Amino acid sequence: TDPIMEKLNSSIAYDQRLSEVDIQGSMAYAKALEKAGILTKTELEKILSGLEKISEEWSKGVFVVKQSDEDIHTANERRLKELIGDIAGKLHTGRSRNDQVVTDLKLFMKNSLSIISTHLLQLIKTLVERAAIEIDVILPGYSHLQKAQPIRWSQFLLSHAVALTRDSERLGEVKKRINVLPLGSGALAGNPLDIDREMLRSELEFASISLNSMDAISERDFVVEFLSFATLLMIHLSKMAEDLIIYSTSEFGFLTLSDAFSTGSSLMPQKKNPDSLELIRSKAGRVFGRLASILMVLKGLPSTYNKDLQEDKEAVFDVVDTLTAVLQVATGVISTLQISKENMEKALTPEMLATDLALYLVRKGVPFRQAHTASGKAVHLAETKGITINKLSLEDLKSISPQFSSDVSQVFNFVNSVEQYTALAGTAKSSVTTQIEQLRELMKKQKEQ
Amino acid sequence: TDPIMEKLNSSIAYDQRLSEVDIQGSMAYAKALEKAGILTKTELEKILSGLEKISEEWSKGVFVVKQSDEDIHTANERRLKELIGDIAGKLHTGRSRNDQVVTDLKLFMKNSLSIISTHLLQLIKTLVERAAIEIDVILPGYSHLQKAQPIRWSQFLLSHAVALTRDSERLGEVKKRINVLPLGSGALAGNPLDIDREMLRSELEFASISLNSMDAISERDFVVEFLSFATLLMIHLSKMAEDLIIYSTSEFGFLTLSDAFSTGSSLMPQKKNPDSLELIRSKAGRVFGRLASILMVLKGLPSTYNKDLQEDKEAVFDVVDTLTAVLQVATGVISTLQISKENMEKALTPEMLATDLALYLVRKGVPFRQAHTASGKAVHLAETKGITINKLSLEDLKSISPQFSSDVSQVFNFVNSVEQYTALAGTAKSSVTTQIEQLRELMKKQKEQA
Amino acid sequence: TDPIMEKLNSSIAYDQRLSEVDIQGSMAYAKALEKAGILTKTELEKILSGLEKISEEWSKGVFVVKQSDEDIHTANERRLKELIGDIAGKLHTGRSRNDQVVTDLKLFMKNSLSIISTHLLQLIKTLVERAAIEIDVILPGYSHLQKAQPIRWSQFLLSHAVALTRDSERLGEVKKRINVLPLGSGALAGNPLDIDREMLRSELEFASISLNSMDAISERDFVVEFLSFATLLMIHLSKMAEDLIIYSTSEFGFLTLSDAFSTGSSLMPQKKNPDSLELIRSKAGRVFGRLASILMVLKGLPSTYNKDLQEDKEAVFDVVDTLTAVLQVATGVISTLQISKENMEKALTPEMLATDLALYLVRKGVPFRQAHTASGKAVHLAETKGITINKLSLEDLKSISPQFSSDVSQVFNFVNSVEQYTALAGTAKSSVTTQIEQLRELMKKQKEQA
Amino acid sequence: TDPIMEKLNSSIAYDQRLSEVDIQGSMAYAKALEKAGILTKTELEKILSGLEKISEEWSKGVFVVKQSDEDIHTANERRLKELIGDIAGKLHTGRSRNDQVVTDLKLFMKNSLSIISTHLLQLIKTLVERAAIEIDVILPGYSHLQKAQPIRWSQFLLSHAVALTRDSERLGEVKKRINVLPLGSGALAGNPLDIDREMLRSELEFASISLNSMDAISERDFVVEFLSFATLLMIHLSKMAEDLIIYSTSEFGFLTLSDAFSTGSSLMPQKKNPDSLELIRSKAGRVFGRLASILMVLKGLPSTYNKDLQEDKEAVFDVVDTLTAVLQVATGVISTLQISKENMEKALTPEMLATDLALYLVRKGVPFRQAHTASGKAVHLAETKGITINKLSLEDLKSISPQFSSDVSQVFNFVNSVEQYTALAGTAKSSVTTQIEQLRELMKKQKE
């Protein structure tokens, strides 16, 4: 076999993290083989004993990988033979690399997803708890990156938290389909020894078992779904990062990241470069790239198994490692950044209340169009008088519309502004309080899984 | 405004299919404005009556679009004003194009996914039912596009059906999240007039309402996951297409597509080009392209609303139409194609039973490796005698292993070969029958989801 | 035969813009057929005459598409036989839809690329001219969206013009490979009539002719690389858009877009939303999506022709139209935006000069590390005294290093700062002037080559 | 600084292959710094001497990376100080990791592209030599994976070599824009010491120098282009792989890969799995993913430098190694595969000559449509008689059309079939010979 090919087929450099799941797969199959009469009870106890030793060797970090090992599967097999001899060979009876490999990857992903979920719920909790605490802070809401209308800082934080919860929800749906046992599919047509797949399922703790052997061997839906979930999660993180990066500019001056998540220069110690957010933003492309690669790998392949499917591992390991690191950095960032309440408030300008002025008339019965026209005239009048709209006198306003009463002075207050949004999902305090409670409830339910 | 700029902001060219859901959204909002005391009952009646006439105008295809109409939303309000005058203007009180547009897209998508669900289930049902009927057919199973081991044709059909049921399940999940009311989120901070959102949900028939206004206005998760579901579904269809394209070659000779789903030449009337399968395969790229575009459009955008989000509609419409056509063509192809039981059985060779010969020894207590070696010797001895392994004598067999008895004759039978796989998911008849039943129940449960 | 199938094969709805190039390909082929003797010198005159009439019909929007016309070709074929009778049938002799279609697309792409080229070079020229005019404007140069060091506003504009000139260079390279005649490749094995491909090349104005019939029929390299060129150009435009969108925020306050390329509400007359820039940014994803789709369509297809290749037209047309519109809008944006020199200069702070304070020491022979430390100490001493570094007394500076002399005052000047960068391509005035010259020269070379 | 943060910011784990180019960049800069009066002649000698020793340490795989080393640049910096002391610190005067990093990546890519060019040209040459020698072989040409019309096996092999020759042309275009010196761009605004960039260009052997410092520092066009070229090249190898996989099925029986590039079972010793071709086919997705990631990384980023740009390296390294391995495996596969002339031969059937029968009439003045209808009648007839088209008697033929003369027999010959395509680019032997000469001339020029 060609040396370059042999090099392209090696995966020991990156698949060793499958050590433990590979062993659990073999212990379960060994027990199954014993039930099918392929192994005697004595042979079983010997194999299970050996496999257990191997497990403690990897766990203790004393397992020794040898140059001949082309992949984790061969490394474990060699080691089993070294410990117990020929008897070890009976372990492959009726089993194929085809069903043993997807079994290891799914078990690995299930464990990986549980860890990812934890870090994800922690990020969501951090935003929600921070929103509750800073619920009185108010700043500009933006559209087209232009100041549109006053909003509570907590409404901004919660919008990200809510998107992240849908990610957490997709994570749970993906895990459900991953939690299906493919072992017992053999190489293509099924397991030829009437192996007890229910025993395998129970032993490995999957929720159910695969419906069709050909599908179970060749489908990589679980890889794609995971990569899709990962990519959308990264899109959300890239948006939050873009926001924070812009809000942390000296021009905006709304917040500052902690030294732990930013870099600087002794020459300009006052300026902090948002490295952590740029890292997070850049990973969206890295993760999207993996999703794109696997989709093209799978596109147009014929049934059943084909070597092309081997590209799955590196893509999954990369995304798992990337998400684990970025979610934690994100939590650290949100948890430790410092907001400048002063600057957020100073960014609120009277010009941003002209819509509320029109809304003031709408509530008194003035038709939408009129109310808008009256507010336009107020803005123009302030202009000509050289002042801002919150400074026009009652007489100035009455000159535009009799509908303006002295209470219109309540319009010119940023708390009264955000407090008009009591309709569900709005930025009024009660609405924000309601979201925090809905999110805490959602997190509980997703934690219970 | 700049003429090229104007053209770039025009969606009227393709967004007219939203005319109906736009009107319904407006009717619901009109009613909520009345409850909020923004409209009188008299005003509500006049607005609703006008919206109804516009709906009819679109329906009867008599609506007249004016060169001044930038988009469907502008066309409808223009027409409503023409019909009922000044009063039409109050309808937009507290509403934004921002929450109005996402509302129309989700309403459109919900109706669209309902139709796609129906075609997807019909495709799965066609695969499952043909599999029950052709359950006795046996043909080669392939790995690396090389004959591996005998399998039932139905096992092959069912592998695709199973994959498509997961697609169906994903569709169900996407639909749940699309079925959430975004109306009443206003331009960014929410609806400013204490609008009754529960009422909006009731009128528009959504299952729940959006939790956060900024999110509801800026997220396009629903477009992305619909495109993800669509792309994975296309991968499955592209694989089934590739299989069928190869099996329809004169070289394999396994099946032939009907005339309705293929093309031919009057110079070679016996040959058929699998056009339908090629189009289906090609749509995987087309659909994937939309998924890729929307992910890039969304990446790095700041909160909250930005014009970039307008790229959503064309991608959704293209994929909705692509899946609808593709799923129906796939159903027709699977339904009408003709298999050659003769060519499929013919492809089954004795060499394909060497594995079964090893398993024969395994079951008689011979260790895995020794059994494999034993079968290899037999394969080799047959090669030397210029005969197929099923022609070796019992005595020749015993010379390789005393574990070979006269019943080894049972190994050289393709029905017996496939019948070995009785473990759940296998190709044995009882396993296939169990799959058919499981899928029938799954389709029942999924069809009930709606 | 199937209804859904036929709809999927219909392209007349979008491929009509290929009307004229299809007729040109036909005229050139007719002529070659006469030379080969397939058409008498008389039939030729009648076929060419019938073609010029069809050309005229489309040219006047007079043409009428029948409900039976599945594509532009079939429409032109129907119209010719319908104009000159049976004779129009001899035109397909030896020709195939396979080599006829790629010929039409390449001709179309060649004309479209010359147009894109003009709009692209115009954008580049606009950036360069504006750089020449506003060469005295200085503002902060950013990294990590944090102020790093002073730069000339012109250096920023030229950084974008330089990237675009590479796109222009790539465009020319793509045009060269598109400028190769595929006609005469037949359906797969070539043309069976020994047609004069040199005549076809000369008549249709291609630079050379395709080397292999199978490759010419099956490759879509030209589509892929046109789309790659377009995606990278869009990446460049998405970056310029992002910068300008940020610079136009009220927070930065560096520039304002003209009314033609932005939108605003009467309620906040001073607010301008950068619509043009957002649309441009959003097209990066739309274009990337097309590239993504064609790559996926081509992946794993076997030789030679397959119906999958039909997805090429829609991806090309969308990107051709997108680029033509986007490039012109970008030109208008750059040409008409208004900068605030005052706000740009006011953003320059003394803290941005500590690096220059270190360089001051380095030029007096102090090692890099010691100079950096001394500047860091001065920065810190100022911080503790609650003053800016340009306000530290010489005595204070000498307490940090005796090497700081009275002439250190010159360090705290922003013109002096940008003027240190005389090395080729830096921001000093002479360097920026040199860049303008090289660009002017590059644009002339590319205009002259196009 | 946060530990997960530190791990993410660290590139040392993978950027070490830039060790030698990083050193070359430093040697060139050191030289220009001496000319600029920043370094004395002795300091220069000491710095160049230390840099050479470091080059040797890496070449001998004896270099010691320390826990504190964040990247290759910091590692070499640390090592030089260890070897020559305080003066090592003068080397970074006016330089930034921003212009240093792109200089190293371009130098590395320039070298990697020369290696890829070598393997790509060898693949093309291998296809061409094989097409020259198996020039008499004829088999079906396919459309929709259905037998369409006879063609020479060489025409098939050459269709792949032609597309690859365009990949080779693109590679040259990408290499030219990469061969532009970015060093001396500083961190953003340029080099602040009037460094002699022409001297840096000459020492590092670049063809020219970057035009604008901000562009030079922030653009990764060269990465995208390389990725675009690599992806299209993989598309091409993707198709070739798909073709060979199908042709290697027992159903087609056209060829069989050698043991070195396939796998098999002792249980079925006569069947070979073309895993070399499947590996090649799957790498298209691997490479496309890298292109997609970098495009997404760059989209929407503002000027000038941003940390996001650090994703460029791993994508480039993966694609360089993938292409290098895949190109050589493809060369071996084409060079060592065994074709079955007999089976390609048997694959040719009379049914595939009906279009030819129609052209035969066409060359006799009979109109396009009528000649077609005519061949169709000959086909229908032979069908009713249960015979192949080439068995029909001249009277059976004439009864359909008087234009059929005994010379119509020459039509039912597959060599005569492929010989009709003499027009440039066709499958006739003369055209195949011409293509072979044209490609050899192209490679000669692309090589020089």
Describe, in plain words, how this protein is organized in 3D.
Four copies of one chain form a homotetramer. Helices cover 60% and strands 5% of the residues of chain A. The first copy, chain A, is mainly alpha-helical and 449 residues long. Chain A has three domains: 137 residues, Fumarase/aspartase (N-terminal domain) (Fumarase C, Chain B, domain 1), CATH 1.10.275; 228 residues, Up-down Bundle (Fumarase C, Chain A, domain 2), CATH 1.20.200.10; 72 residues, Fumarase/aspartase (C-terminal domain) (Ribonucleotide Reductase Protein R1, domain 1). In chain A, strands 1-2 form a two-stranded antiparallel sheet. A two-stranded parallel sheet of chain A has the order 3-4. In chain A, strand 1 and strand 2 form a beta hairpin. In chain A, helix 3 packs across helix 4, helix 5 packs parallel to helix 11 and helix 9 runs parallel beside helix 11. The first copy, chain A, starts with a helix and ends with a helix. At the B-D interface, strand 7, helix 11, helix 14 and helix 15 of B face strand 7, helix 10, helix 13 and helix 14 of D.
Keywords, separated by commas or semicolons:
homotetramer; 449 residues; mainly alpha; Fumarase C, Chain B, domain 1; Fumarase C, Chain A, domain 2; Ribonucleotide Reductase Protein R1, domain 1; 3 domains; two-stranded antiparallel sheet; two-stranded parallel sheet; 6 strands; Argininosuccinate lyase (chains B, C); EC 4.3.2.1 (chains B, C)
